[PDB]
Scaffold this active site. Structure first.
Site, PDB file in Angstrom:
ATOM      1  N   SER A  82       4.308   1.854   8.155  1.00 43.55           N
ATOM      2  CA  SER A  82       3.806   0.860   7.198  1.00 43.55           C
ATOM      3  C   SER A  82       4.963   0.250   6.418  1.00 43.55           C
ATOM      4  O   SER A  82       5.849   0.978   5.942  1.00 43.55           O
ATOM      5  CB  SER A  82       2.892   1.493   6.149  1.00 43.55           C
ATOM      6  OG  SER A  82       1.700   1.920   6.758  1.00 43.55           O
ATOM      7  N   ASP A 131      -0.923  -7.364   1.936  1.00 49.88           N
ATOM      8  CA  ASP A 131      -0.283  -6.075   1.774  1.00 49.88           C
ATOM      9  C   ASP A 131       1.245  -6.206   1.882  1.00 49.88           C
ATOM     10  O   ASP A 131       1.873  -5.714   2.842  1.00 49.88           O
ATOM     11  CB  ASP A 131      -0.807  -5.158   2.903  1.00 49.88           C
ATOM     12  CG  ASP A 131      -0.361  -3.725   2.764  1.00 49.88           C
ATOM     13  OD1 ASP A 131      -0.524  -2.980   3.762  1.00 49.88           O
ATOM     14  OD2 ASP A 131       0.126  -3.375   1.651  1.00 49.88           O
ATOM     15  N   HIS A 169       0.825  -1.203   0.000  1.00 46.79           N
ATOM     16  CA  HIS A 169       0.000   0.000   0.000  1.00 46.79           C
ATOM     17  C   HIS A 169       0.858   1.251   0.000  1.00 46.79           C
ATOM     18  O   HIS A 169       0.306   2.342  -0.112  1.00 46.79           O
ATOM     19  CB  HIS A 169      -1.023   0.017   1.149  1.00 46.79           C
ATOM     20  CG  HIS A 169      -0.491   0.478   2.474  1.00 46.79           C
ATOM     21  ND1 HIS A 169      -0.271  -0.419   3.512  1.00 46.79           N
ATOM     22  CD2 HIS A 169      -0.320   1.736   3.001  1.00 46.79           C
ATOM     23  CE1 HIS A 169       0.065   0.256   4.599  1.00 46.79           C
ATOM     24  NE2 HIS A 169       0.079   1.576   4.307  1.00 46.79           N
TER      25      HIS A 169
HETATM   26  C1  LIG Z   1      -3.100   2.574   6.680  1.00 48.01           C
HETATM   27  C2  LIG Z   1      -2.499   2.641   8.081  1.00 48.01           C
HETATM   28  C3  LIG Z   1      -1.268   2.017   8.304  1.00 48.01           C
HETATM   29  C4  LIG Z   1      -0.662   1.988   9.588  1.00 48.01           C
HETATM   30  C5  LIG Z   1       0.685   1.233   9.832  1.00 48.01           C
HETATM   31  C6  LIG Z   1      -1.350   2.723  10.610  1.00 48.01           C
HETATM   32  N1  LIG Z   1      -1.023   2.914  11.918  1.00 48.01           N
HETATM   33  C7  LIG Z   1      -1.974   3.643  12.554  1.00 48.01           C
HETATM   34  C8  LIG Z   1      -3.002   3.946  11.703  1.00 48.01           C
HETATM   35  C9  LIG Z   1      -2.591   3.351  10.367  1.00 48.01           C
HETATM   36  C10 LIG Z   1      -3.192   3.326   9.120  1.00 48.01           C
HETATM   37  C11 LIG Z   1      -4.587   4.025   8.925  1.00 48.01           C
HETATM   38  N2  LIG Z   1      -5.772   3.084   9.229  1.00 48.01           N
HETATM   39  C12 LIG Z   1      -5.887   1.834   8.418  1.00 48.01           C
HETATM   40  C13 LIG Z   1      -7.103   0.903   8.749  1.00 48.01           C
HETATM   41  C14 LIG Z   1      -8.450   1.686   8.758  1.00 48.01           C
HETATM   42  C15 LIG Z   1      -8.271   2.747   9.839  1.00 48.01           C
HETATM   43  C16 LIG Z   1      -7.166   3.720   9.340  1.00 48.01           C
HETATM   44  C17 LIG Z   1      -7.124   4.824  10.385  1.00 48.01           C
HETATM   45  C18 LIG Z   1      -7.402   6.152  10.012  1.00 48.01           C
HETATM   46  C19 LIG Z   1      -7.322   7.186  10.964  1.00 48.01           C
HETATM   47  C20 LIG Z   1      -6.971   6.878  12.291  1.00 48.01           C
HETATM   48  C21 LIG Z   1      -6.713   5.556  12.671  1.00 48.01           C
HETATM   49  C22 LIG Z   1      -6.782   4.514  11.721  1.00 48.01           C
END
Ligand SMILES: Cc1cc(C)c2[nH]ccc2c1CN1CCCC[C@H]1c1ccccc1
Length: 288
Positions: free
Chosen positions: A223, A100, A50
């Site tokens: 990530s 991913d 991603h």
């Molecule tokens: C992509 C990604 C990748 C990593 C390593 C992250 N670590 C912390 C968040 C986060 C996200 C963001 N997140 C992904 C899953 C859906 C919820 C979304 C999100 C959006 C806003 C606040 C909290 C979560």
């Protein structure tokens, strides 16, 4: 080919974590700025799919190792064939992070040194030697050694202006596994999905929360970085950081609201082994 070992004085940052790779998005936006990765051979960095744009992937990021300013030439980016962030939009799942994982093939061979070294990968002879295991060791036996049905001590690394910070976490892989996975429902956008296993597939490992210990959480910038098991001064990658419930780099309000449920989810490398083994088959890593 001695993977997962520091290369020696008591130095800092990339001296202590010489497999870490830093990824920058070339045309950044909100939620699309940076990622991490792991050096896994002289030509490859493993990260999350991603982190890239789906079109013209190779020109969508820059990658650096060793804490260097210079960026490495990226020859090809290989996504896991099953990855598709839009795959569950039908089910009200706006982003779907199954499979991913991606491999960056570098055009030029890395030269290993004190700040650039490979991490060990599961089900390889490198891991056998690193864990000081016998030549009869199978992939299943490595999985038993690395991911027993328990809360598993592990670690990941966060990066900031060339500084790395190691964070200790616990993989919930015993009696807390179900509770950890169900907490996906706390993630923004995931609250309405009736069966949570639609979001949390068999590809994932789960960390975070406050039992057995208070685990730090990932941010979006982490990530693609390795989730690592440390045994007797050797480091074995078991997962790739994929997604989290709370982004503690922005919204620290939320983690304080839902600390018991603030989980992070990682691609279990034992669940993508056919792909890793095939794509890395010429890299002298000795997959079982
Ligand atoms: C992509 C990604 C990748 C990593 C390593 C992250 N670590 C912390 C968040 C986060 C996200 C963001 N997140 C992904 C899953 C859906 C919820 C979304 C999100 C959006 C806003 C606040 C909290 C979560």
């Amino acid at each position: 080919s001695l993977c997962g070992m520091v290369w020696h004085r008591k130095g800092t940052d990339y001296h202590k974590q010489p497999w870490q790779a830093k990824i920058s998005v070339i045309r950044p936006s909100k939620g699309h700025e940076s990622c991490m990765g792991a050096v896994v051979s002289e030509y490859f960095v493993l990260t999350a799919a991603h982190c890239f744009t789906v079109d013209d992937k190779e020109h969508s990021i820059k990658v650096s190792v060793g804490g260097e300013k210079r960026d490495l030439e990226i020859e090809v980016v290989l996504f896991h064939p099953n990855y598709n962030i839009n795959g569950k939009k039908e089910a009200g799942i706006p982003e779907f992070y199954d499979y991913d994982v991606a491999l960056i093939k570098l055009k030029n061979k890395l030269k290993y040194g004190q700040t650039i070294r490979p991490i060990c990968l599961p089900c390889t002879e490198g891991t056998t030697r690193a864990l000081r295991l016998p030549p009869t060791t199978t992939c299943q036996q490595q999985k038993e050694e690395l991911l027993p049905a328990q809360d598993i001590k592990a670690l990941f690394v966060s990066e900031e202006e060339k500084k790395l910070t190691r964070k200790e976490v616990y993989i919930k892989n015993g009696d807390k596994k179900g509770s950890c996975e169900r907490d996906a429902q706390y993630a923004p956008g995931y609250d309405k999905v009736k069966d949570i296993s639609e979001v949390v597939t068999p590809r994932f490992l789960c960390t975070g929360g406050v039992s057995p210990y208070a685990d730090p959480n990932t941010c979006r910038g982490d990530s693609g970085g390795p989730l690592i098991v440390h045994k007797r001064s050797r480091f074995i990658q078991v997962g790739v950081i994929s997604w989290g419930v709370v982004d503690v780099c922005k919204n620290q309000k939320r983690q304080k609201q839902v600390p018991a449920h603030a989980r992070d989810f990682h691609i279990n490398l034992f669940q993508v082994l056919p792909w890793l083994k095939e794509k890395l088959q010429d890299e002298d890593l000795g997959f079982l």
